[PDB]
Design an enzyme around this catalytic site. Structure first.
Site, short mmCIF file in Angstrom:
data_model
loop_
_atom_site.label_atom_id
_atom_site.label_comp_id
_atom_site.label_asym_id
_atom_site.label_seq_id
_atom_site.Cartn_x
_atom_site.Cartn_y
_atom_site.Cartn_z
N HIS A 41 -26.97 62.62 37.64
CA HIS A 41 -25.96 61.44 37.76
C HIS A 41 -24.37 61.98 37.83
O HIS A 41 -23.28 61.29 37.50
CB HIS A 41 -26.20 60.53 36.18
CG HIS A 41 -25.65 61.50 34.97
ND1 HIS A 41 -24.42 61.62 34.59
CD2 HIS A 41 -26.38 61.88 33.77
CE1 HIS A 41 -24.26 62.39 33.64
NE2 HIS A 41 -25.76 63.02 33.09
N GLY A 143 -18.67 65.39 29.99
CA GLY A 143 -18.56 66.51 30.55
C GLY A 143 -19.29 67.44 30.46
O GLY A 143 -19.26 69.05 31.12
N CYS A 145 -22.47 67.97 30.26
CA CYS A 145 -23.80 67.25 30.75
C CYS A 145 -23.46 68.90 31.40
O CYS A 145 -22.21 69.19 32.07
CB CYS A 145 -23.74 66.23 31.19
SG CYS A 145 -24.00 65.15 30.30
#
Ligand SMILES: [Cl-]
Ligand SMILES: [Cl-]
Ligand SMILES: [Cl-]
Lengths: 305, 305
Positions: A41, A143, A145
């Site tokens: 993503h 942020g 991830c």
């Protein structure tokens, strides 16, 4: 002596963290050999996350759209592919700091260390467990991830988790390093709720053994029990059923302490039925379930890496 | 979101850990530039620790008696000196991994990360606080002496602790990197008992702010209080007195949440007087006091290094 919620030293993983930016989205990637792994993503906007078609979104992305930065130095992307819910970005340079490593898919109840990162930079390290509902309870802001979870066995880093999602209830969901989510979760911003967060019974028992080893033993009693009797109480309190496999894994702690596993179960049963009465065990007022038996042996013996 | 007991990334300190052996005793040293710092009781046998005369014991030790090993490679000792309770071993090679660093003496109530080591090798990382009685509650086995505690500000490691001793009660005592013990403790195996382990009130309040930020707010009430009134209750419960300086430090969390500091004190007062009633706050059933206000801001904002 003393017993603390301890993470693995993070140096070996710190040397693998990079920043990945696609369009307006920046998160973290893991750089091993000449491949950078990151959540797919990264290609999504906030709007896309409501109903993303990742294969269609990816058609519009070329190698040069994935900006990969290791410290202050840019890496050149020479290929990219999607594997389940991760992207593999091939770069022209092998990470010179690559440790010996493996990819592992862990079972519920197993613990691991998380290196929380933002913009490719490490922020902190802490210990987590894969919950029985396949969430983790971490510390992840926007942020984070692409931050990863790992274990170390001497000199080999076993990567087991990559962070992808925060559920509306504040718990966290993610994948192994092949891109497969733990549990039923998906990388869509939708209504996905976690199931019952059951307590990891074998881990609680391990931690009671740790307490005894380190001086805390007021909870030891004159009783014993059986697996079936104990599990009648475990069910009432949303504890995982205890199996003979679990008893076997607790054998070494049983031997070190001289306390039979079923005797410790009888102590746990009384703690569940009567509570702590305002007392503490290893500085905790609840029963801790994010130490494995292997964790307890390791910390109580001084294993290094 | 989510809030975890988080340590600093340990890589920068891992690169400084070495093994130091004098005679039959092996512990850890910290290698910065061309100096290795370690506890002076590396020169002691178990027998010596009952009543050591360190100046006399040191007369019998020469440079070549201090065996310093960095990984698999031996370092050459070209000088040694005692400073308070640490030895400074001059080696002929500057540590090529030396980070930017400072030596800091911390105040009670401040937190830091510990890299537990054995034989110069890292075992794990965890977060500690300098208690008001100048002990710490760590995880230290035989051989862990010379493990250090530290904080990181961007790229600079501030070393604040070196581990020396375990008291008979299972708590831990040590020095700053100039060799001065925190509190009244000494590097002798004798009867030294810790004083009252008071709770770090400002840290508890910071952590309640963290809970509110991360969704846990059942403890918020309709009351307020004053510093003097609150401190009447703090004394009864062995909490540190809250000062105006503390109120000022909590200002930024007050502003982020809109909860005045004295209102949060009123929530804490009710928690102290009535207990948790079986509820939890950020996964804890007791009031956590090893997060500083700066820790809370840092973790809730995503500062990196
Ligand atoms: Cl899709
Ligand atoms: Cl607790
Ligand atoms: Cl002396």
């Amino acid at each position: 002596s003393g017993f603390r919620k301890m993470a693995f030293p993070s140096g070996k993983v710190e040397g693998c963290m990079v920043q990945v930016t696609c369009g307006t989205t920046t998160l973290n990637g893991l750089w091993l050999d000449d491949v950078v792994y990151c959540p797919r993503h990264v290609i999504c906007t906030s709007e896309d996350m409501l109903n993303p078609n990742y294969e269609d979104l990816l058609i519009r992305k070329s190698n040069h759209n994935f900006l990969v930065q290791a410290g202050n130095v840019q890496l050149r992307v020479i290929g990219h592919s999607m594997q389940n819910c991760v992207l593999k970005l091939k770069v022209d340079t092998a990470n010179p700091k690559t440790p010996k490593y493996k990819f592992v898919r862990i079972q519920p109840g197993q613990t691991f260390s998380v290196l929380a990162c933002y913009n490719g930079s490490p922020s902190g390290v802490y210990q987590c467990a894969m919950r029985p509902n396949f969430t983790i309870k971490g510390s992840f802001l926007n942020g984070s991830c692409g931050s990863v979870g790992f274990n170390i066995d001497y000199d080999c880093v076993s990567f087991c988790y990559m962070h992808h999602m925060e559920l509306p209830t504040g718990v966290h969901a993610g994948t192994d390093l092949e891109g497969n989510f733990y549990g039923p979760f998906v990388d869509r911003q939708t209504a996905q709720a976690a199931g019952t967060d059951t307590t990891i019974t074998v881990n609680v028992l391990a931690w009671l053994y740790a307490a005894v080893i380190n001086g805390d033993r007021w909870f030891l009693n004159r009783f014993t029990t059986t697996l079936n009797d104990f599990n009648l109480v475990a069910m009432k309190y949303n504890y995982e059923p205890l199996t003979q496999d679990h008893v076997d894994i607790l054998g070494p702690l049983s031997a070190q302490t001289g306390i039979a596993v079923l005797d410790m179960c009888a102590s746990l049963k009384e703690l569940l039925q009567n509570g702590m009465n305002g007392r503490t065990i290893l500085g905790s007022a609840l029963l801790e379930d994010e130490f494995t038996p292997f964790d307890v042996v390791r910390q109580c013996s001084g294993v290094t890496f």
